[PDB]
């Protein structure tokens, strides 16, 4: 994991998962695995911090990239098989406020919840106030609308 986060081996392309219950270590590097990016949190506090954001605002003229952000090792790519074993927390809010809460060992965080929706699911405002099939119906109709 330290080696991957160091970007010595390709990240969205070497997925690594351990099943501690069976005493096994499985690794994958074939094509076609679906994975997503996540903010790594360490010990109990988020690993991304203010200097990185200051670089992203500066990126408007100074040379910088998302790739730099990954090379800092604050963000990672996680595939569905690894995602089975992580302890992923919804928001920095919960991970900080967490004092008397039940969990205490989060290992990744969402950059934001609204990223779970497709591209058509993204046009719609407040999809969370709508009965879910109403929202499936819009995803079909948007593709029919003209402009």
């Amino acid at each position: 994991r330290k080696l991957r986060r160091q970007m010595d081996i390709i990240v969205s392309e070497v997925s690594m998962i351990r099943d501690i219950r069976e005493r096994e270590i499985r690794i994958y590097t074939d094509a076609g695995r679906i994975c997503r990016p996540l903010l790594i949190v360490e010990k109990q506090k988020l690993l991304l911090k203010k200097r990185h954001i200051d670089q992203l605002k500066e990126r408007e003229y100074n040379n910088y990239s998302w790739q730099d952000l990954v090379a800092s090792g604050v963000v990672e790519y996680i595939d569905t098989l690894e995602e089975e074993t992580v302890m992923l927390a919804m928001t920095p809010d919960d991970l900080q406020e967490k004092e008397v809460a039940y969990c205490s060992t989060y290992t990744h965080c969402e950059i934001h919840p609204s990223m779970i929706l497709g591209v058509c699911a993204s046009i719609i405002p407040f999809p969370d106030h709508n009965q879910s099939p109403r929202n499936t119906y819009q995803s079909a109709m948007g593709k029919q609308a003209m402009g």
């Binding site: 501690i20 219950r21 005493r23 074993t85 992580v86 302890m87 969990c103 060992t105 290992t107």
Partner: protein
Amino acid sequence: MEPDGTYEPGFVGIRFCQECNNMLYPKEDKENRILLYACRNCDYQQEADNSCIYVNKITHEVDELTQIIADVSQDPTLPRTEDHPCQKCGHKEAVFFQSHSARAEDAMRLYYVCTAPHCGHRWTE
């Protein structure tokens, strides 16, 4: 004997031939009135240590404190507990879980694993 006993006679499903390295099978000695175990592909033979040759079901080898390795203590997804006392070591904090098996038996009961390197002890409550 006594009601407060146990049935682990030592089911020796393994006792291979000392020569051809294959499995021994029961066979009768009527002459000596003794069970013997012989390899089929050769003459080698040796007496048994038990009168048993086969058992089935126990129905309740509730199987509560086996297979499950202490190292499961490391898994971040398992719930750490503020509930105290490793019945072995004078230290609180244990990971716990349940069944995790398809012969779930209906065992809703919790299993607790001590997490500090001093025990690796695995009890139940």
